[PDB]
């Protein structure tokens, strides 16, 4: 589960929608199954057929592991304040002198 920034709020539950599965034990459609009209047959004279749809849930941390964002989002100008104590500047200054 990808994230985008540091304080990105997250849901504890991830609902999922799945197609119903045959198998002749539960050959009849269950009670908690809804019907969706999204079985395509044709497209130019568009034709759709019913399809039984089941619903389940998932929980973050036990099935899906939360990932982290890559790169840098917030952009700031460099604006490096000059320092007169590090070694590199102390040698560059003597070289200029």
């Amino acid at each position: 589960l990808q994230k985008r920034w540091h304080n990105e709020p997250l849901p504890q539950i991830l609902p999922c929608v799945m197609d119903w599965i045959p198998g002749y034990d539960g050959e009849h459609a269950p009670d908690d199954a809804e019907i969706h009209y999204d079985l395509p047959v044709s497209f130019q004279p568009p034709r759709h057929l019913p399809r039984f749809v089941i619903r389940r849930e998932l929980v973050v941390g036990e099935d899906v592991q939360v990932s982290r964002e890559t790169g840098t989002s917030v952009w700031r100008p460099k604006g490096t304040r000059a320092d007169y104590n590090n070694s590199e500047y102390k040698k560059v200054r003597a070289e200029r002198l």
């Binding site: 050959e27 009849h28 019907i35 057929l49």
Partner: peptide, 8 residues
């Protein structure tokens, strides 16, 4: 119609 076995 559609049957409960999934066959329209």
């Amino acid at each position: 119609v559609v049957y409960l076995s999934g066959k329209p």
